[PDB]
Design an enzyme around this catalytic site. Structure first.
Site, PDB file in Angstrom:
ATOM      1  N   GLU A  22      -8.090   7.929  -0.176  1.00 38.48           N
ATOM      2  CA  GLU A  22      -6.960   8.706  -0.713  1.00 38.48           C
ATOM      3  C   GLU A  22      -7.369   9.717  -1.766  1.00 38.48           C
ATOM      4  OE1 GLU A  22      -4.012   8.571   0.468  1.00 38.48           O
ATOM      5  OE2 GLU A  22      -3.861   6.642   1.505  1.00 38.48           O
ATOM      6  N   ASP A  31      -0.117  16.169   0.760  1.00 37.69           N
ATOM      7  CA  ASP A  31      -1.124  15.486   1.586  1.00 37.69           C
ATOM      8  C   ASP A  31      -1.286  16.216   2.920  1.00 37.69           C
ATOM      9  OD1 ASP A  31       0.912  14.590   3.335  1.00 37.69           O
ATOM     10  OD2 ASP A  31       0.643  12.454   2.828  1.00 37.69           O
ATOM     11  N   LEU A  43       2.618   8.444  -2.293  1.00 41.80           N
ATOM     12  CA  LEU A  43       3.535   9.365  -1.681  1.00 41.80           C
ATOM     13  C   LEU A  43       4.851   9.356  -2.491  1.00 41.80           C
ATOM     14  CD1 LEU A  43       4.544  10.920   0.846  1.00 41.80           C
ATOM     15  CD2 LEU A  43       5.062   8.874   1.944  1.00 41.80           C
ATOM     16  N   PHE A 115      -0.567   0.422   3.597  1.00 42.41           N
ATOM     17  CA  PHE A 115      -0.414   1.346   2.486  1.00 42.41           C
ATOM     18  C   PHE A 115      -0.187   2.768   3.019  1.00 42.41           C
ATOM     19  CE2 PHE A 115      -1.788   2.308  -2.027  1.00 42.41           C
ATOM     20  CZ  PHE A 115      -1.942   3.672  -1.918  1.00 42.41           C
ATOM     21  N   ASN A 143      -7.638   2.046  20.498  1.00 37.26           N
ATOM     22  CA  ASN A 143      -6.206   2.277  20.493  1.00 37.26           C
ATOM     23  C   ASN A 143      -5.704   2.860  19.184  1.00 37.26           C
ATOM     24  OD1 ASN A 143      -4.689   1.443  23.111  1.00 37.26           O
ATOM     25  ND2 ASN A 143      -6.524   0.179  22.937  1.00 37.26           N
TER      26      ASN A 143
END
Length: 175
Positions: A22, A31, A43, A115, A143
């Protein structure tokens, strides 16, 4: 592995992992998805309104920040956000059994994923959750690499996907 290399896993934990993914920013920024963020991946809001982001910031920190916080404040908020992601996993009937089945390093990857995406986002990946519970690591990582979470913002997610594949900290070495 040298003596130092064998010590590297003891220096890594969920805080250091998310700190690398981050970054650390003391001013509001957008972001990779265009959302107002601050600190270590906090956020603020999905609103396009900077005023809303500033209002959310002041509420989160408890003072008139005018868009700027200190490193100590970022760290405090980060600890709260990590604790929230863990609590969100453990109270969820779908995520908890998968998380419990994972080793310590993959449990960090799980907390990081939650998160970043939130609980419903992670709990919606039916196939990946089954693959992880069944220790089908390569399939789980393939995946995850199909997801919008990864594909829209690869640099923030790639390390986490590797960590689900390997259960080691190697993706976080040699920044």
């Amino acid at each position: 592995p040298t003596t130092e290399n064998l010590y590297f896993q003891g220096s890594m934990n969920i805080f250091e992992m998310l700190r690398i993914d981050e970054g650390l920013r003391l001013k509001i920024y957008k972001d990779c998805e265009g959302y107002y963020t601050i600190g270590i991946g906090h956020l603020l809001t999905k609103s396009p309104d900077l005023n809303a982001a500033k209002s959310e910031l002041d509420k989160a920190i408890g003072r008139n920040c005018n868009g700027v916080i200190t490193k100590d404040e970022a760290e405090k908020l980060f600890n709260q956000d990590v604790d929230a992601a863990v609590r969100g996993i453990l109270r969820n009937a779908k995520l908890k059994p998968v998380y419990d089945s994972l080793d310590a390093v993959r449990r960090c990857a799980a907390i990081n994923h939650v998160f970043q995406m939130g609980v419903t986002g992670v709990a919606g990946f039916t196939n990946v959750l089954r693959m992880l519970q069944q220790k089908r690591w390569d399939e789980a990582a393939v995946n995850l690499a199909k997801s919008r979470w990864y594909n829209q913002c690869p640099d923030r997610a790639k390390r986490v996907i590797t960590t689900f594949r390997t259960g080691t900290w190697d993706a976080y070495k040699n920044l």
